[PDB]
Design a protein around this ligand. Sequence first.
Ligand SMILES: Cc1cc2nc3c(=O)[nH]c(=O)nc-3n(C[C@H](O)[C@H](O)[C@H](O)COP(=O)(O)OP(=O)(O)OC[C@H]3O[C@@H](n4cnc5c(N)ncnc54)[C@H](O)[C@@H]3O)c2cc1C
Ligand SMILES: NC(=O)c1ccc[n+]([C@@H]2O[C@H](COP(=O)([O-])OP(=O)(O)OC[C@H]3O[C@@H](n4cnc5c(N)ncnc54)[C@H](O)[C@@H]3O)[C@@H](O)[C@H]2O)c1
Ligand SMILES: OCc1ccc2occc2c1
Ligand SMILES: [Mg+2]
Lengths: 107, 1216, 54
Amino acid sequence: PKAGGPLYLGRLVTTAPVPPQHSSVHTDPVLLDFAKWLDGKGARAEAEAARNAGSSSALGLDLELPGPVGERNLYTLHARGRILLVPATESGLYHQLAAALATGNSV
Amino acid sequence: APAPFADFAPPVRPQSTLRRAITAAYRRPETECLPPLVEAATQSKEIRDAAASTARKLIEALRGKHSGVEGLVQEYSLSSQEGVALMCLAEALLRIPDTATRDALIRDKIADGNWKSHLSRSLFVNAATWGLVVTGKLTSTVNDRSLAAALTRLISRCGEPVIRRGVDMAMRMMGEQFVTGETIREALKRSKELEEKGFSYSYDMLGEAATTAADAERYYRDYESAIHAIGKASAGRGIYEGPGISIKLSALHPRYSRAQAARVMGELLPRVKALALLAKNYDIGLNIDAEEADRLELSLDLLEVLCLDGDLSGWNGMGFVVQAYGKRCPFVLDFIIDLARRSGRRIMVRLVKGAYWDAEIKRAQLDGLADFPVFTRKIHTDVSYIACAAKLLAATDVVFPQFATHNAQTLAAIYHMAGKDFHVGKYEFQCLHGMGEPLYEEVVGRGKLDRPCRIYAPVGTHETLLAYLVRRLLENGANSSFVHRINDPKVSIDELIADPVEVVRAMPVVGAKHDRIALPAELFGDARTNSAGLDLSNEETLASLTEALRESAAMKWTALPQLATGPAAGETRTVLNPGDHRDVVGSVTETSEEDARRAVRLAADAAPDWAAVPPSERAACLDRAAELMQARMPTLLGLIIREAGKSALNAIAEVREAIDFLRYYAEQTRRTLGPGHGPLGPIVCISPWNFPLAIFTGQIAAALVAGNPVLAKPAEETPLIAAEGVRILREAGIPASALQLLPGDGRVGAALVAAAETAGVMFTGSTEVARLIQAQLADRLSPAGRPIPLIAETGGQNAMIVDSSALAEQVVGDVITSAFDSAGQRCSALRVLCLQEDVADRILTMLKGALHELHIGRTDRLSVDVGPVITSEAKDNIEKHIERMRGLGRKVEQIGLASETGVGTFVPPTIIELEKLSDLQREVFGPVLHVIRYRRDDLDRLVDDVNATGYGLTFGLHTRLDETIAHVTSRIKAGNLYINRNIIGAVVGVQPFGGRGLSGTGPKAGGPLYLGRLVTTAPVPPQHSSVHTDPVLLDFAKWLDGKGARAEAEAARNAGSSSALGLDLELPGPVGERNLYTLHARGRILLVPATESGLYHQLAAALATGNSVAIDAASGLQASLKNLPQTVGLRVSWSKDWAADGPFAGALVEGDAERIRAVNKAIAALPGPLLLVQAASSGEIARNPDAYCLNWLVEEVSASINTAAAGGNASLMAIG
Amino acid sequence: ELMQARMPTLLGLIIREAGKSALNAIAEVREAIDFLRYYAEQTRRTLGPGHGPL
Ligand SMILES: Cc1cc2nc3c(=O)[nH]c(=O)nc-3n(C[C@H](O)[C@H](O)[C@H](O)COP(=O)(O)OP(=O)(O)OC[C@H]3O[C@@H](n4cnc5c(N)ncnc54)[C@H](O)[C@@H]3O)c2cc1C
Ligand SMILES: NC(=O)c1ccc[n+]([C@@H]2O[C@H](COP(=O)([O-])OP(=O)(O)OC[C@H]3O[C@@H](n4cnc5c(N)ncnc54)[C@H](O)[C@@H]3O)[C@@H](O)[C@H]2O)c1
Ligand SMILES: OCc1ccc2occc2c1
Ligand SMILES: [Mg+2]
């Protein structure tokens, strides 16, 4: 994560905290479609994990940070891009997909 | 048969001189109200100095002793969101009744994270209220994801100790501060301490705004039980020393309104009398709280009867609030003082400033009224208060003044105005529990000012108190409020003790309106004049309207084929009132198909002369027509009421909409139309019966002002108001050759559509009829060899989604209005209510109770809520649907209809409980609400189900949760969205109206793209641009360059820039609402290319506007799109069977005239939505960069958000 | 606080050791100060017993 930013300290502990201001009201639509698909096949635990990931993801965060006058300093969270998924089990793959899709990524 | 309007709105009683003086001041200009108040409020210099010294002393004592939430936030270093989230968690934990169980959950489960796992209902449902508590700022909706993050963060950081502190704080605030007690017994026990110091109490059981008979009965029994408890505790102390009760009339009847005055006097009055009789027996005060401005005068009729009722004689405990923020206040006081003299009852008069200020501003703006019924500068209310106190203090022998205020300046002014002679019973002050005690502990008692204060003491559970806590917090928490300013270190005591009377006296214009609050007529500023409505709570208006309505029923209304050459002969028949077929409204002469064809030829011959009238002069005709319709509104109302089954309220809205269309299209013309925007030619305007003046006028006005002569074919059911609209337009200067009225049925419409000179068709009506028109036009090409433009605005299957965070009373009101207003005969009407499972039973019970309070009947009575359906055929069609549903086992709730409905065609408002949204097939255009339930996790599937009907007109969402708003509004596909409000009555230029799919081709009526469809070269609409470039368009442009298609790549880049996809505007409108207008992709566009270059141009146009495409595989052009970037490939499909690969949202066609005609026929044959087709030849694509117009490749979406839904207006908290 | 108070001395070292101009040495020390205070504040906003160190 970026130095001098709110995600940094969470990389230095074994369980990351929720950083200040770190949330988003947006839900990835592909995540939503994935959760419905999991629902349909009866993967109830995974569908719940998918919905939870969709909500806790901060993808789409778009903040203005306090700073000097005459400048607008913006901070935004986007998808990483394409995530390599190395699953072992079907449930693990569904959980990995949920995490990656909820954050806007392809896999 | 009863004479039309003979019983329209008779007053409860003849209006006395004193009552008439009240009504005359209702919306009196602010500059006229203030001078007499300044005069009445003037005091000597000695008194003003003494009052200032007293106020300073009170304020110094207040500031010298001035924290619970603030101390918690400080101790745990909480952010604002953490503080709010903590209080929401505490609120939820306090819903666990058993203390040991709650503490176990805290210690073992909550404190160790995973609070979400243990706590159907968002924890944050009331976060807007807690936000006000924590931050002092109101936010209408809740950022539940921010709060969830904050709660996780604070619990993980601080653990059980912070949860414990939050729970204890919330318990204290909700049990002891926001209320005196949870029950009347607890409240009475806690009142002893301050009663021993010289305070008294008035208890508020928090009932308000009954939605159902059962609600009203519950509030009644709560008041009755409280009176017993209060009277037992009073134990003979009497009405001044002892406690009393306060009631709200709105709690005691579900239809407490002027429109239902007869039910109010017959049903509500006896309930108040029974409570008053009990208060009399215990000799306690019973105060009638004051509510919205439109209930003031009605409440006076109850006060009059009660004070004159001999059964209540001997008791002086009847009390009544008057709101000094209201322009009628001094005249109301004159009436009350006189009533006290006549009755011999020493009426207890509570003078307040007023609690509904923001809402009164919004309401007056929405209703287009002349002025506000309240002041708009806070200092005006203060002067009004002091002036009214002077009037009350001169009448203490006949009334008991009660000065309710937390403002130490107001208090001091009155304390000195009242003078040194005091006895208990002369007057008192009042304050709110848990707010006013610090001030009044400097007042009550011989060691202070030795004046008594009555504490208004809310009593109720957490659920009850939270319902309207936002309104109560704004009373003392807005930037202009004394209690906010006392706590502001930047506000000096000198500022707080400023004398409002002398400040107002010295202003350059005494009583000027607030500069930042628009009068309703000025909502749109310089763009245009807002239409004006009528106040159906104003007795003067009701009396004048009664006469105008009766006069309108004595008119010999006719509709004739008004050809350019003059009225034509034809088959003549009467037009009957749908609510009573014995009431003949007028006569219509219908147009022969021969004369319809002749009218088109005359329009074609007249086209150059009308096109040559400059746009500004055409617009001036529309503006003159709007003035004429405004002046004629009362007469137009009467015709609409009788011809179309509309209530007076709905007819007012109908005429306002017509006026607004005229003025909006006039202004849009003045902004856009020039010599190069040539008219299409004769336009056939076919309109529906259900908005028989507004949509009729809108289509015609738009076509005319764009320079097209018009053939106006109104619905066969409602020709009279259409003929009057044409008469008005002709009087306004539209030449007879430019506007021909052709009454008759669908045959006249079809004959007009098929006429060779018809250059465009504007259709509003059913989807099925639009499909027939689409098929008719598919045969046709213009002389230039291009499709005849069709605007086809069609039906809806409109849903509202309600989650567990919505306020049931608000939902039910918006549902009852959206589903059953106009007997559901609005295209926007709510058809499918979707209730989250956890709240569905409660809301459904309330909805059914509200349904049964509707009055169905002939609409020439103000008390009628729901009129008839337009015809027996419509009635039969609706009833067949109801019986089909009933036959499938679905639960059906229906109002019982009165026998008087038998003379017309009525369908009772009906609620049908469905299992799945697929139980519905097509739009049922009647008063039939369907209800489905959904589990929260299935919300996204539900939105899919709503979209799956293929309709896309209006859509409503009731939620407080930002995550749900963002989710639902991003996934729903409808043209008009409404958040936390009803889904009907879209306003021109504010909610540009129209949908997608089976609901419309667009462009939206009342929006900025409309006129551009009615000319051959569309202008650039005002504000129509976007800085955003579609990224797939950009990828396609680079691909084209890589392929060597250099000119096409440049055209693609130009399309990317020219596209207005991503336009996102807020439109001016009333306060307390945000009205947004955005341009999105249409969806999947069918491309029918002929050449590779044509395909590249079509793809560029479609991609630049955000769309995907299905390309006709029969074009043989597959090899032209080899090696597309993946981003473009995702948007591209090839279609061999167009009907299999839809629905499409538009089409682009390349070819010669006969290829275009053939393709247009094949497109018209596709199932489902009418497609907006644009065609061009290969040569046109080469010559004209705008061969395909990007205006028609985007979809307009209007969203109207009620930002007052949380209970107040945050922006207006800064307006004082 | 110590880096702020000793900034003039730190500047001299940074100027001579790392080839920085005075303005860029000021920026260097300021950035160190800001990291210290920012991570301190972010810690006060977030870290609790369950966020164990690596
Ligand atoms: C015991 C008690 C009982 C009450 N009962 C009722 C009741 O039955 N019905 C009712 O409607 N109110 C009632 N009120 C009043 C209302 O709830 C507020 O408490 C009151 O209006 C606040 O006035 P103030 O002197 O306390 O505060 P101040 O801050 O001096 O005044 C605030 C008031 O100024 C007015 N105001 C604010 N901005 C503007 C503006 N831009 N233009 C014009 N006026 C403005 C509003 O009325 C606002 O509430 C009652 C108040 C008390 C104390
Ligand atoms: N999208 C909107 O803005 C909007 C607005 C109001 C009403 N509507 C829809 O209008 C419908 C109700 O109005 P209505 O009952 O008058 O609709 P309708 O389709 O019955 O009739 C509309 C008009 O088309 C005419 N007509 C009928 N058959 C025709 C034909 N074969 N060729 C040419 N014209 C023909 C009628 O005479 C009438 O003037 C509802 O479906 C409602 O949802 C849509
Ligand atoms: O908050 C005090 C209060 C008391 C009675 C009321 O009646 C209507 C609004 C209102 C406010
Ligand atoms: Mg019809």
